[model samples]
Target: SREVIPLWEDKVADGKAWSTHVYSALDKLGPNLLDVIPADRSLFCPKYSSLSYAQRKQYWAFVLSSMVRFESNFKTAMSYTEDFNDSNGNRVISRGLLQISIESGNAYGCGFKSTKDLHDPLQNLSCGIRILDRWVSRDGRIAGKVDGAWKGGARYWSVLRAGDKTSYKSIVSWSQNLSICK
Candidate 1:
């Protein structure tokens, strides 16, 4: 059965202002075929933020776990029913546990030469985090939280699916979650 992956709670450990990326932010997405998670923060310029540099190492451990929870029944990164084709005539759908789109393949330059790369867990999480990191900026990275809580705009399908607009702190929670390390 599908689990309810929660968004990173908007708070932190060690009495810090930075937050975290708790789950994969897929709880809001139903079994909607066309549903998707928003891909970038550019659209909602007055939108949102991120957290932790030291803790990023910690959260990486679980990013893959959260993504697994978010995968829809038929379209999991590990291969589900039909490998979610966005059907936009370009075959650009959100694949993998994080539901990344082909557009990301073009924008982030994470070195994803083929759309097929979005299908593997390692590929998805690795590349997905690259995009996620862009959405999160801390320590005067972007003159202090340029966007509000908009996750990533580069995402193709979920622009309105589940957590496109009201998202924050995947980088933060990953921060806190990792504080225990070093």
Candidate 2:
């Protein structure tokens, strides 16, 4: 289930200044970013049930790269935690890599207590995963199909939507080619 890179954009092409102090590049959050996912099937989680192993891995990777591309560059991961301006004007301001709402995470049982908890890199990633799983399961093909309600093929990130389908596919393919989750 270790999905590698597909479309193939080398990480080296990114600026060298990408920080790794709290996390050392690929393994910054440790070798298993997707480790929070269960090993096998679980009737309790339809999203977990519906996906193939590689699809799950690739999807996870695609989302990560999507965040890394659009949101914070990880140079300052904490930079994205606040929505003090309320520009989007929604309860879900989209913090962290998956850009989950603080309100939504609590509803979905991610148990975020404070801004610091939400800001911690690894914890945020885990929360992101949890939220995505829940959203896709509830939203169904509206999620994968990118309907008006769910927005696009993916519910969270704009880049994974229909217009960005090429990029999303390439990202999933890129993840399929490499292993952040050995």
Q: Whose TM-score is greatest here?
A: 2
RMSD of each: 13.1, 8.7
Q: Candidate 2 residues 1-182, lDDT tens each?
A: 23334211344343222222212323332234333343222211235435654455554544465555545444323334343534356433556544556765677577888755666655565555555555544443323443245432256665555444565565444433443422
- List the global CA lDDT of all models: 0.36, 0.46
**In candidate 1, what residue range of length 10 has the lowest lDDT sum?**
10-19
> Against the true structure, what is each candidate's TM-score?
0.41, 0.50
What are the runs in model 2 whose C-alpha is more than 4 Å off? Answer: 1-55, 75-93, 142-147, 151-153, 164-182
Deviation from truth (RMSD, Å), model 1: 13.1
Candidate 2 versus the native: TM-score? 0.50
Instruction: Compute the lDDT of residue 169 as modeled in candidate 1.
Output: 35
